[PDB]
Paper text:
Self-labeling protein tags such as [name] are powerful tools that can label fusion proteins with synthetic fluorophores for use in fluorescence microscopy. Here we introduce [name] variants with either increased or decreased brightness and fluorescence lifetime compared with HaloTag7 when labeled with rhodamines. To engineer the binding site, ten amino acids on helices 6–8 in close proximity to TMR were chosen for randomization by site-saturation mutagenesis. The changes in spectroscopic properties result from single or double point mutations in the direct vicinity of the bound fluorophore.
HaloTag9 increased the fluorescence intensity of 16 fluorophores, including rhodamines based on the popular SiR, carbopyronine (CPY) and TMR scaffolds. HaloTag9 showed altered electrostatic surface potential, as well as changes in dihedral angles and rotational energy barriers of the bound TMR compared with HaloTag7, explaining changes in extinction coefficient and quantum yield. On the other hand, the mechanisms behind the increase in fluorescence lifetime observed for HaloTag9 are more complex, involving factors such as changes in electrostatic surface potential or the positioning of the fluorophore on the protein surface. All except one fluorophore showed notably higher brightness when bound to HaloTag9 instead of HaloTag7. Photostability measurements showed that the higher the fluorescence lifetime, the more photobleaching occurred, making HaloTag9 the least and HaloTag10 and HaloTag11 the most photostable tags.
Residue numbers in the entry: 3 to 295
Write the structure that this text describes.
Amino acid sequence: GIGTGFPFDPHYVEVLGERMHYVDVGPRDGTPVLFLHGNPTSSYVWRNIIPHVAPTHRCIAPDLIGMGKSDKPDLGYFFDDHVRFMDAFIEALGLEEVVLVIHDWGSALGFHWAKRNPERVKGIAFMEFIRPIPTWDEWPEFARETFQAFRTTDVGRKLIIDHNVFIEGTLRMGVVRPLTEVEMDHYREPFLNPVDREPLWRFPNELPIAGEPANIVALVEEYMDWLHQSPVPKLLFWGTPGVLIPPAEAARLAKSLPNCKAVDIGPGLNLLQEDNPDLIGSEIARWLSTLEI
Ligand SMILES: [Cl-]
């Protein structure tokens, strides 16, 4: 079955006075492949994808600040905080040119960094990514009232912080197949202490839905405008029914975006990595072999 282990040796780097953890496997030479997770996951989400890429390419998978095995300072964990820490993580590792593999909030980080530093990005593989959601009617009906409740300081914090609903409920409702207890324990581990759950609540409050928050909408629009014109090689994975993007819009987008290959992974919600890791990993590896890297 789908692997549950996390066999990767820990690596740590000091970033803005805090320690960040990252996976680092594969050959030391060549262009590195930088894997960026989202909410409420960690590098654990890439555990079954990396082994398809690591034979031929260096794979770097950081835990976002406040998440995974990274340090957990008392921040607001706004998108801007993650931008500051990820910018500094990339420089602290001395990365020059990279290929990005990105998901959920990791995709906002990756696309925003790529738009600002396009000379350093040699390809982008992406899935279930942050885009403007024009109205609440484009958010999946089965999850709509809860995400609306998440975006409050009263009910939303009670659910996400006090009761850990993003881990115990939303995560599982983001995967089609059932998650095992061992997998759930890996996802629970960074957030056993309720005071460490701020990122889990701030992230859904940053989602660009129905024009709010205006600053995130503007930033995401800017990187989507870039992506619609840039020649950067692109690989889009999508599933049915999806969460952040529905199938027809995914297929339409992959046709519209320059130099973009699309892969239908079959059934999927948000964490496509948990529903078809072998296809995602094998297709990333095949696509990498076509790039000038
Ligand atoms: Cl979120």
